[PDB]
Write a protein that binds this DNA or RNA. Sequence first.
DNA 1: CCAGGGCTGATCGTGCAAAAGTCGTGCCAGCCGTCT
DNA 2: AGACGGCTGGCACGACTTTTGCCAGATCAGCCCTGG
Lengths: 50, 50, 48, 417
Amino acid sequence: VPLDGGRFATSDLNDLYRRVINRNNRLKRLLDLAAPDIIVRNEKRMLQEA
Amino acid sequence: KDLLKFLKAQTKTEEFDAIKIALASPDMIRSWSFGEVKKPETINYRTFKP
Amino acid sequence: KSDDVNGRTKMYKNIVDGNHQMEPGMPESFNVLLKEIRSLGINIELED
Amino acid sequence: MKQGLQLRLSQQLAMTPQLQQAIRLLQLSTLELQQELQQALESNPLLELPVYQGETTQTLQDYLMWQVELTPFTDTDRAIATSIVDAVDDTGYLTIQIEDIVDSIGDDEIGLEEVEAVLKRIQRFDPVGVAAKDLRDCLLIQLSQFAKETPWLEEARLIISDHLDLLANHDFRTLMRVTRLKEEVLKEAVNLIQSLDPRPGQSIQTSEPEYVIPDVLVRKVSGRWTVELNADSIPRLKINQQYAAMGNSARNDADGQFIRSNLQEARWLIKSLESRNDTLLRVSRCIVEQQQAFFEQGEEYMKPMVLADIAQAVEMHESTISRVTTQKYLHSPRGIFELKYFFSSHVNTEGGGEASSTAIRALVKKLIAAENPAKPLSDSKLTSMLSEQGIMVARRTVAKYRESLSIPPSNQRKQLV
DNA sequence: CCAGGGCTGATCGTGCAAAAGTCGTGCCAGCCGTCT
DNA sequence: AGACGGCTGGCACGACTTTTGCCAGATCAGCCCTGG
């Protein structure tokens, strides 16, 4: 349902999905790099909140 | 395909008695799903394709 | 008169042909509700 | 005067792999840049009512299926009609041929005559001349539909039957001597053929959206326009304070080195992105400075330029400017163009000056358009009046410009007055 | 306790050139208009 | 009806543009070890 046509600007159902997807991607690619415990736990906390 | 029963199979429904509800297992979710999403991008604005 | 997609066209055809018969089927909003519930970790389906 | 291995320095150069990555970072557009930038953001951890439920629209295929639902076909006829209408383009002409449709059905009983019967049954649907095999059997349907009372109908049918090439080549004299038809009384019959709505299925829905994205902005401040970058479109990265304030506190060497390396990489990336933005802005400002006349006066008043001309005005290299000016769309009051569109080949004119190729092409466009319809202007005459203007390009270049402009040759566009 | 030596990492750097590509302009072949 | 002139396009040939593909090292400053 685009507003101005140039950009659709999906809202209220895709913003949450985008947040979850990008945060999960960052956490997954940070988990295998032997990241520090504080950073990985903080990222997991934000994933839980999302 | 004979193209004459393929069209008739589209418009069909079950008896659908006694709807139930229960907790979903990860195996059940993977059975529901057809693929896994990996990127937050929704639509490309260069070609307007999925 | 509503979201029964496969039934609206059939009723219109029967009315134009002069039959006045109904094929009820199943509303689309109930399918939408089932999909929205399954989008949460809750299994739900219709038995037989 | 010899062959001998010799050596003498006059140049200097140096580069590293991460510098190569940073220099290729500016070759690509912003929308494609953001994908790779998000990819690096995902790897580096210390870097960082509404309208819904629109209406359903009625396209041509849906409308034709709707009309099929209310017509009395058998089950086999309905399946054939569904396949046929599925194989229908937006313009209204079916894409695959009838034997292909028969193969798609794949039934021994199904025959070409049966498929023809069903197709001709659906030919009479609301958009007349829809689902026609080609142009020949689309105009003929409407000619047959029109009542016999209007004149020149038989003439129009005779021309449209088997003289399609004869009309397409605009060879009116041979068309006359082939049809034995009236002199200059055929013009109204040809006009009747003209007023026949080719491509009838197009008019079922014509909504086209607006898809424009600007990379560089220019606005006229009462003369000597100044150029600004797109604030929303430009990317930007910000260092993360939480993780930047825990590298020293950590007492583990592994964690400390991890945070140090990621800080180094993030700062280098931020610096490279800022440098790319600055270089793009400088290049855009310089090209708009050298193209101030064209924005004011039009395309045909454009001075030719080469990458050397714009590279000498700055301290960058020709290769650097070429890499920057790819897939960049700048927005101007006249419209949206590309940064690479400005550069063009030059041709020498009379008096020692040179004229840009695109300018001469636009001039040829307007000169050809503003011509008498009875006598077309050919390439040689075009060269002649261009030489009169003083441009004196060759007839070969005139033909190339006319062809790239998609205008057919002069002898092809001749028409009855 | 103060000064000299070692050592490690932090910091600097967006151009040169070779080859593909594009440009303009000529040469020649094939189809068409027209007078004899 | 045939020849002559003309128009158009494919192909070729210099002349000039533009596009990509290169892959570190030395040098300096602060800290630690050690001699006076």
